[PDB]
Amino acid sequence: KLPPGWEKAMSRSSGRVYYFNHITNASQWERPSGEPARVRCSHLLVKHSQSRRPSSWRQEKITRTKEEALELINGYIQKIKSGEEDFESLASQFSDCSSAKARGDLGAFSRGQMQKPFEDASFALRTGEMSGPVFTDSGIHIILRTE
Ligand SMILES: OCc1ccc2nc[nH]c2c1
Ligand SMILES: [Cl-]
């Protein structure tokens, strides 16, 4: 039927079908379009108090809860999707990863390099697509596949 990970769902508020991807946590109204050895991704990480390393270049001790991090991630996605703000503008300013200085770019990578939830989301994204919140031991990511 649909590309890897995609499924139909019903909107609770509107009643229109939409599409949801249980690997990338992407969701969208439109039916998804149509694996490589490597992909290239950028990401925006929001760390929290249960992150493996509760520290980042933004904050020496990161104290926010997982739920507060998820709300930050959700707001960033809203601003990206609405075009009020660009993915790399937000990554540069707010990602708790050192790759913020590279606009969130992590470069090319193969399978078996990144943490598994990140890897799987990255390889299920089509070029140009963005994930929803992706949970790993580092925190919560928004992932943009650039190549
Ligand atoms: O493997 C997933 C992943 C990727 C990039 C990261 N930067 C900080 N923590 C990270 C975790
Ligand atoms: Cl880390």
PDB file of C-alpha atoms and ligand atoms in Angstrom:
ATOM      1  CA  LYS A   1       0.000   0.000   0.000  1.00  0.00           C
ATOM      2  CA  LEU A   2       2.132   2.850   1.376  1.00  0.00           C
ATOM      3  CA  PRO A   3       5.873   3.599   1.765  1.00  0.00           C
ATOM      4  CA  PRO A   4       7.754   1.984   4.693  1.00  0.00           C
ATOM      5  CA  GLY A   5       6.230   2.876   8.056  1.00  0.00           C
ATOM      6  CA  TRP A   6       3.207   4.808   6.794  1.00  0.00           C
ATOM      7  CA  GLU A   7      -0.394   4.058   7.902  1.00  0.00           C
ATOM      8  CA  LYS A   8      -3.810   5.756   7.574  1.00  0.00           C
ATOM      9  CA  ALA A   9      -5.421   7.365  10.606  1.00  0.00           C
ATOM     10  CA  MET A  10      -8.467   9.454  11.446  1.00  0.00           C
ATOM     11  CA  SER A  11      -8.265  13.028  12.700  1.00  0.00           C
ATOM     12  CA  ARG A  12     -10.098  13.246  16.037  1.00  0.00           C
ATOM     13  CA  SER A  13     -10.918  16.926  15.578  1.00  0.00           C
ATOM     14  CA  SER A  14     -11.750  17.097  11.850  1.00  0.00           C
ATOM     15  CA  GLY A  15     -12.637  13.515  10.827  1.00  0.00           C
ATOM     16  CA  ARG A  16     -10.447  13.589   7.692  1.00  0.00           C
ATOM     17  CA  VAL A  17      -8.008  10.751   7.049  1.00  0.00           C
ATOM     18  CA  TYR A  18      -4.348  11.604   7.454  1.00  0.00           C
ATOM     19  CA  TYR A  19      -1.116   9.689   7.175  1.00  0.00           C
ATOM     20  CA  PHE A  20       1.179   8.780  10.043  1.00  0.00           C
ATOM     21  CA  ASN A  21       4.587   7.083   9.982  1.00  0.00           C
ATOM     22  CA  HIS A  22       5.384   5.003  13.052  1.00  0.00           C
ATOM     23  CA  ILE A  23       9.138   4.960  12.352  1.00  0.00           C
ATOM     24  CA  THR A  24       9.661   8.717  11.778  1.00  0.00           C
ATOM     25  CA  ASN A  25       6.644   9.953  13.805  1.00  0.00           C
ATOM     26  CA  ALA A  26       5.828  12.133  10.783  1.00  0.00           C
ATOM     27  CA  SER A  27       2.193  12.954  10.154  1.00  0.00           C
ATOM     28  CA  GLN A  28       0.570  14.750   7.234  1.00  0.00           C
ATOM     29  CA  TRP A  29      -2.724  15.164   5.423  1.00  0.00           C
ATOM     30  CA  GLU A  30      -1.426  14.221   1.968  1.00  0.00           C
ATOM     31  CA  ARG A  31      -0.806  10.659   0.788  1.00  0.00           C
ATOM     32  CA  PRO A  32       2.953   9.971   1.031  1.00  0.00           C
ATOM     33  CA  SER A  33       4.903   9.967  -2.220  1.00  0.00           C
ATOM     34  CA  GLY A  34       5.889   6.717  -3.949  1.00  0.00           C
ATOM     35  CA  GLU A  35      17.178   1.771   0.347  1.00  0.00           C
ATOM     36  CA  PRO A  36      20.376   3.820  -0.041  1.00  0.00           C
ATOM     37  CA  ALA A  37      23.663   2.802   1.524  1.00  0.00           C
ATOM     38  CA  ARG A  38      23.994   6.226   3.178  1.00  0.00           C
ATOM     39  CA  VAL A  39      21.780   9.172   4.043  1.00  0.00           C
ATOM     40  CA  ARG A  40      22.645  12.685   5.137  1.00  0.00           C
ATOM     41  CA  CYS A  41      20.574  14.294   7.873  1.00  0.00           C
ATOM     42  CA  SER A  42      20.423  17.335  10.051  1.00  0.00           C
ATOM     43  CA  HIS A  43      18.750  17.286  13.408  1.00  0.00           C
ATOM     44  CA  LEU A  44      17.622  19.408  16.311  1.00  0.00           C
ATOM     45  CA  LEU A  45      18.047  17.792  19.712  1.00  0.00           C
ATOM     46  CA  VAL A  46      16.248  18.838  22.869  1.00  0.00           C
ATOM     47  CA  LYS A  47      17.822  17.111  25.851  1.00  0.00           C
ATOM     48  CA  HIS A  48      16.109  16.461  29.165  1.00  0.00           C
ATOM     49  CA  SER A  49      16.897  15.266  32.675  1.00  0.00           C
ATOM     50  CA  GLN A  50      16.936  11.574  31.671  1.00  0.00           C
ATOM     51  CA  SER A  51      19.226  12.198  28.696  1.00  0.00           C
ATOM     52  CA  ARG A  52      22.356  10.009  28.830  1.00  0.00           C
ATOM     53  CA  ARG A  53      24.397  13.221  29.163  1.00  0.00           C
ATOM     54  CA  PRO A  54      22.194  15.906  30.765  1.00  0.00           C
ATOM     55  CA  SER A  55      24.441  18.694  29.445  1.00  0.00           C
ATOM     56  CA  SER A  56      24.919  20.695  26.253  1.00  0.00           C
ATOM     57  CA  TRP A  57      26.630  23.787  24.871  1.00  0.00           C
ATOM     58  CA  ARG A  58      23.413  25.671  25.748  1.00  0.00           C
ATOM     59  CA  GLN A  59      23.143  24.550  29.373  1.00  0.00           C
ATOM     60  CA  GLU A  60      25.707  23.098  31.751  1.00  0.00           C
ATOM     61  CA  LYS A  61      23.006  21.187  33.683  1.00  0.00           C
ATOM     62  CA  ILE A  62      19.924  20.363  31.623  1.00  0.00           C
ATOM     63  CA  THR A  63      17.031  19.969  34.077  1.00  0.00           C
ATOM     64  CA  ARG A  64      13.862  20.058  31.942  1.00  0.00           C
ATOM     65  CA  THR A  65      11.658  16.959  32.019  1.00  0.00           C
ATOM     66  CA  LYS A  66      11.077  14.664  29.040  1.00  0.00           C
ATOM     67  CA  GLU A  67       7.596  16.130  28.789  1.00  0.00           C
ATOM     68  CA  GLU A  68       8.910  19.711  28.717  1.00  0.00           C
ATOM     69  CA  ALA A  69      11.412  18.699  26.017  1.00  0.00           C
ATOM     70  CA  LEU A  70       8.608  17.116  23.973  1.00  0.00           C
ATOM     71  CA  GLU A  71       6.604  20.328  24.202  1.00  0.00           C
ATOM     72  CA  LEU A  72       9.643  22.294  22.998  1.00  0.00           C
ATOM     73  CA  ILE A  73      10.117  19.855  20.113  1.00  0.00           C
ATOM     74  CA  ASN A  74       6.410  20.067  19.262  1.00  0.00           C
ATOM     75  CA  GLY A  75       6.506  23.866  19.161  1.00  0.00           C
ATOM     76  CA  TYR A  76       9.571  23.832  16.897  1.00  0.00           C
ATOM     77  CA  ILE A  77       7.830  21.460  14.483  1.00  0.00           C
ATOM     78  CA  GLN A  78       4.803  23.756  14.427  1.00  0.00           C
ATOM     79  CA  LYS A  79       6.958  26.752  13.577  1.00  0.00           C
ATOM     80  CA  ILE A  80       8.850  24.833  10.883  1.00  0.00           C
ATOM     81  CA  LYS A  81       5.675  23.465   9.310  1.00  0.00           C
ATOM     82  CA  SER A  82       4.034  26.880   9.322  1.00  0.00           C
ATOM     83  CA  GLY A  83       7.084  28.555   7.822  1.00  0.00           C
ATOM     84  CA  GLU A  84       7.389  31.048  10.673  1.00  0.00           C
ATOM     85  CA  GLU A  85      10.843  29.608  11.195  1.00  0.00           C
ATOM     86  CA  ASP A  86      13.355  27.469   9.278  1.00  0.00           C
ATOM     87  CA  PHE A  87      14.712  24.158  10.489  1.00  0.00           C
ATOM     88  CA  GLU A  88      18.340  25.312  10.542  1.00  0.00           C
ATOM     89  CA  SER A  89      17.553  28.625  12.168  1.00  0.00           C
ATOM     90  CA  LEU A  90      16.011  26.669  15.060  1.00  0.00           C
ATOM     91  CA  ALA A  91      18.772  24.033  15.081  1.00  0.00           C
ATOM     92  CA  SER A  92      21.516  26.684  15.194  1.00  0.00           C
ATOM     93  CA  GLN A  93      19.785  28.476  18.068  1.00  0.00           C
ATOM     94  CA  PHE A  94      18.278  25.672  20.112  1.00  0.00           C
ATOM     95  CA  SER A  95      19.714  22.230  19.377  1.00  0.00           C
ATOM     96  CA  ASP A  96      21.434  20.660  22.406  1.00  0.00           C
ATOM     97  CA  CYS A  97      23.915  19.010  20.014  1.00  0.00           C
ATOM     98  CA  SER A  98      27.264  20.511  18.990  1.00  0.00           C
ATOM     99  CA  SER A  99      26.019  20.181  15.399  1.00  0.00           C
ATOM    100  CA  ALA A 100      23.956  23.300  16.099  1.00  0.00           C
ATOM    101  CA  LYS A 101      27.034  25.150  14.868  1.00  0.00           C
ATOM    102  CA  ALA A 102      26.638  23.356  11.507  1.00  0.00           C
ATOM    103  CA  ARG A 103      22.941  24.199  11.281  1.00  0.00           C
ATOM    104  CA  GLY A 104      22.236  20.707  12.674  1.00  0.00           C
ATOM    105  CA  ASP A 105      24.041  18.879   9.856  1.00  0.00           C
ATOM    106  CA  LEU A 106      25.509  15.525  10.895  1.00  0.00           C
ATOM    107  CA  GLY A 107      26.927  14.576   7.491  1.00  0.00           C
ATOM    108  CA  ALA A 108      26.470  11.289   5.712  1.00  0.00           C
ATOM    109  CA  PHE A 109      26.148   8.054   7.676  1.00  0.00           C
ATOM    110  CA  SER A 110      25.427   4.340   7.183  1.00  0.00           C
ATOM    111  CA  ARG A 111      23.339   1.896   9.181  1.00  0.00           C
ATOM    112  CA  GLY A 112      24.938   0.799  12.437  1.00  0.00           C
ATOM    113  CA  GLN A 113      26.446   4.217  13.239  1.00  0.00           C
ATOM    114  CA  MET A 114      23.710   6.209  14.990  1.00  0.00           C
ATOM    115  CA  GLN A 115      21.415   5.215  17.824  1.00  0.00           C
ATOM    116  CA  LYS A 116      18.794   2.849  16.461  1.00  0.00           C
ATOM    117  CA  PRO A 117      15.626   5.022  16.663  1.00  0.00           C
ATOM    118  CA  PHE A 118      17.534   7.819  14.932  1.00  0.00           C
ATOM    119  CA  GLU A 119      18.976   5.538  12.267  1.00  0.00           C
ATOM    120  CA  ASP A 120      15.615   3.983  11.442  1.00  0.00           C
ATOM    121  CA  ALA A 121      13.852   7.342  11.207  1.00  0.00           C
ATOM    122  CA  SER A 122      16.674   8.702   9.069  1.00  0.00           C
ATOM    123  CA  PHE A 123      16.488   5.842   6.580  1.00  0.00           C
ATOM    124  CA  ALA A 124      12.668   5.913   6.448  1.00  0.00           C
ATOM    125  CA  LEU A 125      12.627   9.616   5.556  1.00  0.00           C
ATOM    126  CA  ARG A 126      12.562  10.431   1.867  1.00  0.00           C
ATOM    127  CA  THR A 127      15.029  13.077   0.687  1.00  0.00           C
ATOM    128  CA  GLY A 128      13.723  16.428   1.863  1.00  0.00           C
ATOM    129  CA  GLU A 129      11.345  14.974   4.457  1.00  0.00           C
ATOM    130  CA  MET A 130      11.311  15.748   8.152  1.00  0.00           C
ATOM    131  CA  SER A 131      10.534  13.468  11.077  1.00  0.00           C
ATOM    132  CA  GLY A 132       8.283  14.054  14.020  1.00  0.00           C
ATOM    133  CA  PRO A 133       9.745  13.673  17.512  1.00  0.00           C
ATOM    134  CA  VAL A 134      12.232  10.794  17.587  1.00  0.00           C
ATOM    135  CA  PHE A 135      13.241   9.419  20.974  1.00  0.00           C
ATOM    136  CA  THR A 136      16.754   8.176  21.755  1.00  0.00           C
ATOM    137  CA  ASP A 137      18.942   7.984  24.840  1.00  0.00           C
ATOM    138  CA  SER A 138      20.278  11.472  24.023  1.00  0.00           C
ATOM    139  CA  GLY A 139      16.897  13.151  24.084  1.00  0.00           C
ATOM    140  CA  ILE A 140      14.255  14.040  21.499  1.00  0.00           C
ATOM    141  CA  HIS A 141      15.225  14.819  17.881  1.00  0.00           C
ATOM    142  CA  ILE A 142      13.658  16.449  14.877  1.00  0.00           C
ATOM    143  CA  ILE A 143      15.374  14.883  11.863  1.00  0.00           C
ATOM    144  CA  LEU A 144      15.600  16.431   8.403  1.00  0.00           C
ATOM    145  CA  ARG A 145      16.928  14.249   5.606  1.00  0.00           C
ATOM    146  CA  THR A 146      18.998  16.335   3.210  1.00  0.00           C
ATOM    147  CA  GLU A 147      20.504  13.550   1.035  1.00  0.00           C
TER     148      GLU A 147
HETATM  149  O1  LIG B   1      22.622   8.490  17.367  1.00  0.00           O
HETATM  150  C1  LIG B   1      21.681   9.503  17.673  1.00  0.00           C
HETATM  151  C2  LIG B   1      22.348  10.808  18.018  1.00  0.00           C
HETATM  152  C3  LIG B   1      22.803  11.648  16.996  1.00  0.00           C
HETATM  153  C4  LIG B   1      23.422  12.848  17.252  1.00  0.00           C
HETATM  154  C5  LIG B   1      23.582  13.232  18.580  1.00  0.00           C
HETATM  155  N1  LIG B   1      24.157  14.369  19.136  1.00  0.00           N
HETATM  156  C6  LIG B   1      24.043  14.200  20.436  1.00  0.00           C
HETATM  157  N2  LIG B   1      23.442  13.051  20.779  1.00  0.00           N
HETATM  158  C7  LIG B   1      23.131  12.400  19.608  1.00  0.00           C
HETATM  159  C8  LIG B   1      22.515  11.183  19.343  1.00  0.00           C
HETATM  160 CL    CL B   2      24.874  12.426  24.166  1.00  0.00          CL
END
